[model samples]
Target chain A: IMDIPVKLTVELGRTRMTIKELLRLTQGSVVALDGLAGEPLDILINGYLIAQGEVVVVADKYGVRITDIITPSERMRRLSR
Target chain B: DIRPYDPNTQRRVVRERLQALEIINERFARQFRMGLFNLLRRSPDITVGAIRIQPYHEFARNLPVPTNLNLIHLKPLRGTGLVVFSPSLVFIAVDNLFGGDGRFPTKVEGREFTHTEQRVINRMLKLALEGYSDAWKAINPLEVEYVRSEMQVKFTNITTSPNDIVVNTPFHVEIGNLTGEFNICLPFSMIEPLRELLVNPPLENSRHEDQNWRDNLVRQVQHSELELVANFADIPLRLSQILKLKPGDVLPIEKPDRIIAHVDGVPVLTSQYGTVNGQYALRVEHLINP
Candidate 1:
């Protein structure tokens, strides 16, 4: 696990758009998102929802502060026999 | 409710597919009218009739005796289609070409057309085929090629199945009092694959979307970039804390419970604060289960 690599992604906001509407979007199209302003961003590993955090800056670099971490206990309780 | 079902004359075509052919024929009539005029040096009124779908046997049985039945090949499409000529129409055009009143003699049944009438038929077919090529520009770049002409319908066998349906396009033509008619016949099976394209041409409407984007999207996913970070304190903006801030400011706190990790400003996990190899590190602690 120490030497293996994994994919990580962070979504500032996610949205659903029609194909025509998506093609219509060019630079400065001002797309609206379902997530509210100043809201925490979502984090995923291999596209699976795992955690969320807020924006933070570290000297010359930009970073984030993690707030919510997904628990497996809730997944165990989810609907499925 | 059960209706009478006949396996022989089954009509199998998508809704509005035949309607598209009607529109094609309508546009074809306009070009065909001009093409005939170019051949005749005189405009003949051409009326495009409603398109019909019927069994091959019925279509072959209904043709007038001693008519011009020519077999043609649509270059891009498979199989053959028939182009028919009414005897009176060819006779009238023949008479008009030789300084006569474009009128057919009343007795015209048991005789074949002369070389003069045949040459005129040949010229008319060439022009009509040109119009057919132009009319099919809406569907695809289709070229019409003449094969052989037969005076009998039995010679023109487009399909082996007598039950197979054919798409028929008829044209009513008139030059003064002389009335002539012609029809174009194509086997429906040959065009069965073009059901969707025939309904609405690509240039006019795009009711169907392509799936190439999905294939391309998978490759795009590999090139995407995202930022992940481990954050500390989230204050409601202590502007004073920023006003008195200088380069390399540090605030130390007694042992903190846990640090939050975020990817793209979204909190993903809680981790324990620690240090490793001259650098601060955080170990994953709890899942913020959703």
Candidate 2:
């Protein structure tokens, strides 16, 4: 069985914060991630990492460009079901 | 949020989702692309694939109205398939790009490779699945019955290009270590989702067509007096000496005479040769079943 590595995305975050709470909070409201800040970002596909990439800015736009490609053999282990 | 209600339409939406997935889902796209290539080239001896579907009650909930979603998974079946080749043609095209008559090798020896090599063929089939989904979405909506089929594909006959040019492809890269090419076949029902629209009455028509066709066809087959005897495994040959000495040369019958039957070249039965009225025929003498 081949083993593959996948990473969860980091830059884009989905939170359960309500709109009312956001409206009530001032400009300095901070929301912490479920993981530590130093943790590598997850580059996911349908919740599967498959790979990891660092976030970058392209003319004020945020983007994530893949840096590594996983091998086919690894996929079997990652998707054992 | 988008809600597609028709079964065909829903399937089409999922197909598009898969297409979009190619960008982010490398394994998914690669699996499909390479699987198709291997199938086309007939490089791999076998290919195995699976259809995975997840049926959900609702989709994108709490956004106006929730839609129903039946997710699909198209991937290799994992180590169980026979890679069929064209008897007349071998060594198909690489990507089947800029089409024309594909190149075929003069030699016709069969090569059997390991499962790793087979995965390449699996990926090529997945690749074929991509275009299949696109073409299907363009012509027809998805069917509910397909969802119920739960990822299983039933197909026979795939003719995309009349020249048989698209049917073959070549592979240059190696799967771990082995590398070669092959010729492949795709049956219709295998890519049925692509025909959701083109098929008259669609899968819905199956409910009616199957019953009538079966009833009509079965009666004809059962009532027929002549039994079909196929011989795929071997053919009876006359001795060279006997053949050369012919001039109405009557050769004595061998110690025993028996008729052999086969299918696709495999022998299975023996019968007595005789004539029914004026027609020459075989009467089941024994079952040399394999």
Give the top-scoring candidate (lDDT): 1
Please state the error at residue B217 of candidate 2 in Å.
2.3
DockQ of 1: 0.02
For model 1, residues B1-290, the per-residue Cα lDDT tens digits are 23443222234442345666777788888888888787677888989987777778878888888899878998777789889988877877777788886554545566787777788888889888888888888766788998989898877778755545688888999988888899999987567777666666545542243356556788889898767587776545475787888989776555558898766556678999889998998888896766
lDDT by residue for model 1 over A1-81, one digit each (tens)?
388777988777667666577769898666777665444567778877687665555675656567557566533332111
What tier of docking accuracy does candidate 1 attain? incorrect
Error of 2 at B192 (Å): 8.7
Each model's DockQ score: 0.02, 0.01
Tell how far residue B169 is off in model 1, in angstroms. Answer: 0.8
B1-290 in candidate 2: lDDT tens per residue?
A: 33322211212122212232222123323444555454554333323222211111111111111111112222321111112222122223222322433343334344443344334334434454454354334333332111111111112112211111111112223332333332222222233443433223324445567789889999888886643564323334566774477586554544446777754334457877778989877788788632
Q: What TM-score would chain B of candidate 1 score versus the native chain B?
A: 0.65
Model 2, runs deviating above 4 Å: A1-81, B1-205, B223-254, B261-268, B272-290
Report each candidate's C-alpha RMSD, comma-separated, in the order given.
22.7, 33.0
